[PDB]
């Protein structure tokens, strides 16, 4: 299964998805510390639920018709793919919904990696090793 490099993942979000620099630096950080950019990363939690893919998204609310709810309306397998489209789409829904309920600019606090590792980073510095000619 595909495991991205950090700068490779950053370049992908820019080239193929035209994400803003603000978006990229946040998603790269989350991806690094949730999964080491491993699209097949999977973690079975204490509540018998599972986190899937590069963004370690949980099947209790977000994926899987058959278990919990399925807000992102996708089989969790779709979040464990070489192609990250659906992972990103579903992550953006999580960010949007969290922000709605949590408050402006708090969208990423839904991710453990963000809360422990990234809200305290200098994410312009963090991206510096990739963004330099």
Q: Which residues are catalytic?
A: 34, 51
Q: What is the token pair recorded at 50?
A: 């599972």
> What single string gives the DSSP state of each residue in 24-46?
HHHHHHHHHHHHTTBTT-EEE-T
Give the residue from 126, 124, 90 showing the smallest Cα distance to 110: 90
In this structure, the strands spanning 57-58 and 42-44 are unpaired
Give CA–CA dist 52/28, Å, rounded.
16
């Amino acid at each position: 299964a595909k495991v991205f490099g950090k700068c490779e993942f950053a370049e992908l979000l820019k080239r193929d998805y035209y994400l803003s620099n603000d978006d990229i630096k946040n998603w790269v950080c989350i991806a690094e510390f949730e999964s080491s950019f491993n699209t097949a990363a999977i973690n079975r939690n204490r509540n018998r639920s599972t986190d899937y893919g590069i963004f370690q998204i949980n099947n209790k609310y977000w994926c899987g018709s058959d278990y919990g709810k399925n807000v992102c309306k996708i089989p969790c397998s779709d979040l464990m793919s070489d192609d990250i489209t659906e992972a990103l789409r579903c992550a953006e829904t999580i960010r949007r919904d969290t922000e709605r309920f949590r408050g402006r600019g708090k969208g990423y606090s839904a991710w453990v990696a963000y809360n422990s590792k990234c809200k305290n980073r200098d994410l312009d510095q963090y991206m510096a090793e990739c963004w330099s000619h």
